[PDB]
């Protein structure tokens, strides 16, 4: 009677419903059948039904157990049969759900799952735009999860079935209420339910109650906790958890049993001063991530999320924003583990510069709506990593007019967690910027036309006119190729095949310098960590890509501005960092060198000639100017300081041709 | 305050969803977005959402008037949209839809109308599978509909709003019930309403009634007609229909009206005789029809209908199957004028030889499945032509089983409408044949494997082991290519690319024999009577077409088994036609001719000199055997008797090469 | 066939230039060059005999700019006229200047009134290129409209050559002009209608679908003939019979007043609407009888025409006239 937790992820047999043969071929999951044809740029790429069908040998010996099938994900409408019988319908691509299938399965032979996954386009099941590709398919783990007929459930919205709400927190002590769902399926009968928190090997905490269970009961129990001087969830500082069991017992005997983690916090936003966790200042220095890679889609296996992470804490990076919906659960495991503030939201996104809507006025896409948010919240209730709940990315008002729905979304989020203050990303003026705790704003200036410096202006005034909003960035970026290299620096047409990667380091360094010097800005999250698919896109180095990323889409290649923020927002790891070494070609005669460095100061070599040192200024840059090149080959060092120094080198050509002028 | 019907379908703004900048074309209705992709073949063709855009106008002087949009059809799921708030949904490609915008407009200026049409693939609207394609788009007519706030109401499943129920019909006496629904958007006050019969301009009957109307009132008035001595509807022998007025007065002034048709007519069907209209036997001659064409796909204009009709009477057809769906009212109204009985079906599609299924058993499926069919029966009720609803064409049990839902929908036809028996088309044993009042079986005895004897064999056995049944053949047929022609006859692989013209010709010819010898067999239709469009088919003359037409897709050219029917099925037209007149190529030393026609016997003559007279059999066939030619080029020419004959004539080339024998 | 139904046929190799497309028909490349040689003596030896063939082409819409054929057209010419003296070389053209001045006859493809303009810039450009040219064997290789059969309207006005509407009236309208202007005209020594038959080409966005050109006086299938090849057929078929009510397509009508045309060989004809004579029309010289303010009632109307005599030929359809309309 220990759970079981069984992974069905191999040889599943596949076939498009448009495909009216019948014959399939082996997939195995995670499994996209968009990773190839939206991300070679087709527009038109295949949404519409894909049908997945394995056979599972029911076990003669789990007679007498529960038996459910949970999806993390499958986009975005899935329909599952037993046995070819329809045992149930999820709608929406992001959320977990699960089947009970105890009653519906013959013990002790091979039954069929088959699963007919639909990714065709809806009005009725938000995201209905995006500037992202919406991946069909089983693009998530399944499981069969195994339980004693008397049960902690995992059957509301498929979440782990326990909610640790946290009502009191502070240095002295924290009180949570543990909320656990409870479902029997034997004869009525009462249990014991254990509440054990610990540290390692130290018990923290252990309560217990007495519960009476009706046959057929599915009931919500909640027992309080009380920590005296407790260790709380510091962020980078200290991302400390407790481990929470859950046990249910009978004569002396466990019968079922979950583990969550509890990483006890609080925090608030000033208006003035920014964002507070645990009562002290901390600056918001965030990146946005889509769940998608090269070659994959959103195919993601764990490597993937790991090595996202561990990019993005080697940039010092303390906050994100998981846009635009509901991730993996191990991704916020990840983010809870090593102390990154997150943003979580649910996909009603708008249509941006694009045509359509992202919100229809129709009930059904509403209730589904409300769902959609409930799954986000109860399924991610437990991660201290989760600050803020995302309600919405650049809706508009004309047209159906999402206001009054969007102040239904917010009241719904504040009943279901008191806890957490929502938050959005505007693109508009108005209405829709007064509804969510928190509000952010998607600026691009300085891309999309004009300079960095309206920014600045947007920021003062907004904060001058609206002193009560609590203003942060929820996106700003500008797109880089890292094969679009250019000597001089001139602004690029954004929606133009030519995105040099100068100007993205450019408007990076300018907008960090607008950001760093604004502390009632909350929060800043730049667009985006990684390039990441769009198939309508027709920019940069190829279509298909969003190419604003700080690494490649591949995750192989940093671009420079990368290592602008790592000098600035990991100051503990010594580094220095040779800017525009992709530029091999060099046509200028008077040329400046710039490193990016956590050391006081830096020296340039060229040719094994020292051109002498130079100071690093606030924002972590040393510079050079009208350095000399000889005609041809030249070899470019940059040290720093001290008898065992780092360094950075290249080697540029130098060239004095052309073109007219 | 006329009744207006305006014609909206001219010059909408079109673009597809997938195409996110916003950019439109000019479009035409009758359009569809499918009739160039799924019609090359294409098995993976766009199934999505299409976006179509006008202004209208909306005239000051209609202020106070009620004002109605009202579509014959949109495949499959529509969202309407004025001044860009949305209006309402429709799902389900085959059924009118309609919507009042009486107080949702701005009078005196133009609004906006957007439809959102969307053909993606669905698992909750029938057809989900066929044999067809699910050409998307607004596929029919838009009108604007104006009448007083007093009206005869338009809002009952898009209906005429009137139900002309024939309650008993004899040559003595017709009485009936005319079911009236009305709608009052005025202030609280009386009407009388007014059902006017008659026949060209002698006036059979005139009822009245005072109805009181509450504001807001929607309700049904019943007013009783009795006929004596009644015209009835009698198939082609007379067609005759009687024509009602209906109408609204107020203080000695008409305030609305409509008109719709009376046909009366009885029949039945019995298990050992077949079908008989108005108490008199009545062979059903019967065949198919797709509603698409080449080049346009199911954009069909009205003389595209009437052009179908004209051909199916040329061959001496005297019923129809409207496979697989409701059909446009027009083509429904061309079959009561020209006397064609009719089965009329809901879309409850299943696989056939292919894979998925027809029936998916969760609600939302099973709800919309019955708002198809209410839509149908309320929509056409009232064409005489109309004898049979279909509910089914090729379920099968295996996975889930649609019997227990079929029953609910025959339980819900036969309230709906006691007037006609319920039927359906099957390709199964057990149970599914057990519950329609009619049956019927889709059979390829000699197309799909086997010879045509296994038909006689099947219906005999079926006859004699389920004496009850009221045996129909709901699809009988072979393909053929007019460009496929071989001078001796070889029964062709069905699914190759070979379809040689004379193996459809000698399929029809036996079939047409088995079934003339059958007079228990209460109808038969041949599949089809033209080439229609399946995007998935690769077999015959090209991908994307089945062809098992008698005419081919555009319409042009009748194929030899055409004219086999209509020597047999239009006795009264004097023809003569010569078989195999597109195998211009001979081999065969021994040459044999076949012609059809109603004359007794027929001449040959090969190079100007006769062959003699043969006897017509009682299939209208003559038959030359032994014919020789002469190498090279021979003129063959067939003659009916008398001085002033008919005639047929072919040049063919006969050669004496091949190839090893 | 055309041997057999004594047809005067012009037969070209396929030496074409791009139109208003981009790229080049001509490619500076002794490879290109020698192949097209082959294919021209391949035409004329292969096809030697048929005494329907009167003109060799040698290309259609050639132009100066880049790879200059000129020259490289002087020697086709020249290698035509060895091959055989006895038919005269022709071509086809788009342009002004010295790639006119090759072959024996010449002609040019013009679409005055189509792609911009009126018809009577055809026949401004016409009389000064005789006049200018008194030496010239002027035709007309192409002109034509777009039509497709579903598009009708009950007005008459120009379309957009490039876009999704080409009401059918628009071409019958082009062709009746044009005609006039060639029937004037006895030095061009033969027109030729682009095209006789709808067709095939990939690129196309225009008229009532993509990939096609709508430019036939018949549809692709052959299945159709557009209102434009009954007033052919009357003019230059005069032995046949017939008559024809225009606009039949045009089922809908709004205008208050009518106008229904007929192409006839009778010398007169008679309207009926609702089965009451509107009475007779004469036929003018380009046998077109037509009845001006014909009054409809609303709703179903039955037009009918009959030519003269007790035994008439006749042409009817059915229209739905509507009061409705959109602003005005
Ligand atoms: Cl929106
Ligand atoms: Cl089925
Ligand atoms: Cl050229």
Redesign the interface.
């Known amino acids: 009677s220990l759970r079981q937790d069984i992974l069905l992820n191999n040889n599943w047999n596949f076939?498009?419903?448009?495909?009216?043969?019948?014959d399939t071929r082996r997939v195995d999951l995670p499994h996209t059948w968009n990773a190839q044809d939206a991300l070679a740029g087709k527009?038109?790429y295949?949404?519409?039904?894909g049908?997945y069908e394995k056979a599972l040998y029911i076990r003669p010996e789990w007679k007498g157990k529960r038996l459910f099938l949970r999806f993390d994900g499958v986009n975005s409408?899935a329909?599952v049969?037993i046995?070819?019988?329809?045992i149930g319908?999820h709608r929406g691509g992001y959320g977990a759900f699960i089947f009970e299938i105890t009653d519906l399965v013959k013990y002790g032979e091979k039954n069929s799952v088959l699963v007919?996954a639909?990714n065709?386009?809806?009005?009725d099941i938000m995201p209905l735009?995006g500037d992202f590709n919406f991946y069909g398919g089983i693009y998530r783990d399944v499981h069969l999860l195994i339980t004693d007929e008397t049960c902690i459930s995992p059957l509301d919205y498929a979440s782990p079935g326990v909610y640790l709400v946290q009502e009191v927190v502070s240095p002295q002590e924290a009180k949570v209420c543990a909320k656990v769902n409870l479902s029997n399926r034997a004869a009525d009968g009462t249990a014991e339910l254990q509440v054990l928190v610990t540290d390692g090997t130290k018990v923290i905490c252990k309560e217990s109650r007495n519960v009476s269970l009706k046959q057929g009961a599915d009931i919500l129990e909640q027992l309080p906790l009380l920590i005296q001087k407790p260790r709380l969830w510091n962020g980078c500082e200290d991302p400390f958890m407790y481990q929470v069991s859950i046990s249910l017992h009978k004569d002396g005997k466990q019968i079922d049993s979950v583990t969550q983690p509890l990483g006890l916090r609080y925090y608030h936003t000033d208006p003035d001063k920014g964002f507070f966790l645990n009562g002290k200042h901390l600056p918001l220095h965030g990146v946005c991530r889509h769940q998608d890679r090269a070659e994959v889609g959103n195919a993601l296996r764990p490597q993937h999320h790991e090595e996202d992470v561990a990019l993005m804490r080697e940039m010092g990076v303390n906050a994100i924003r998981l846009a635009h919906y509901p991730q993996a659960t191990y991704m916020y495991d990840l983010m809870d583990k090593h102390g990154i503030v997150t943003w979580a939201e649910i996909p009603f996104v708008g249509?941006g510069g694009?045509?359509?809507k992202g919100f229809?006025?129709?009930a059904?896409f509403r209730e589904n709506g409300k769902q959609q948010l409930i799954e986000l919240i109860r399924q991610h209730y437990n991660h201290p990593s989760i600050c803020f709940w995302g309600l919405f990315n650049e809706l508009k008002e004309?047209?159906?007019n999402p206001v009054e729905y969007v102040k239904e979304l917010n009241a719904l989020a504040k009943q279901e967690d008191p806890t957490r203050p929502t938050t959005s990303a505007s693109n508009q003026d108005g209405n829709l910027n007064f509804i969510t705790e928190n509000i952010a704003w998607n600026r691009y200036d300085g891309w999309y036309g004009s300079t960095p410096k309206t920014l600045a202006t947007f920021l003062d005034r907004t904060h001058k006119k609206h002193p009560e909003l609590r203003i942060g960035i929820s996106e700003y970026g500008a797109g880089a190729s890292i094969y679009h290299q250019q000597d001089s620096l001139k602004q690029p047409s954004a929606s133009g095949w030519w995105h040099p990667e100068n100007w993205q380091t450019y408007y990076h360094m300018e907008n960090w310098k607008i950001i760093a010097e604004r502390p009632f800005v909350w929060g800043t999250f730049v667009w985006n960590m990684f390039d990441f698919g769009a198939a309508?896109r027709t920019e940069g180095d190829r279509p298909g890509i969003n190419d604003k990323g700080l690494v490649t889409f591949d995750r192989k290649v940093r671009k420079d501005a990368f290592y602008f923020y790592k000098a600035n927002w990991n100051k503990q790891e010594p580094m220095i960092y040779l800017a525009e070494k992709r530029c091999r070609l060099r046509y200028q005669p008077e040329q400046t060198f710039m490193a990016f460095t956590t050391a006081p100061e830096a020296e340039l070599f060229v040719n094994g000639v020292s051109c002498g040192k130079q100071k690093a200024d606030t924002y972590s840059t040393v510079v050079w100017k009208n350095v000399k090149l000889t005609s041809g080959e030249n070899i470019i060092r940059v040290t720093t300081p001290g008898k065992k120094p780092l360094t950075d080198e290249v080697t540029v050509e130098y060239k004095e041709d052309r073109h007219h002028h």
Do not use: W
């Open positions: 076939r498009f419903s448009h495909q009216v043969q019948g527009i038109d295949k949404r519409g039904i049908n409408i329909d049969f046995n070819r019988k329809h319908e007919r639909n065709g386009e809806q009005l735009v249509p694009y045509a359509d229809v006025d129709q059904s004309v047209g159906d309508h």
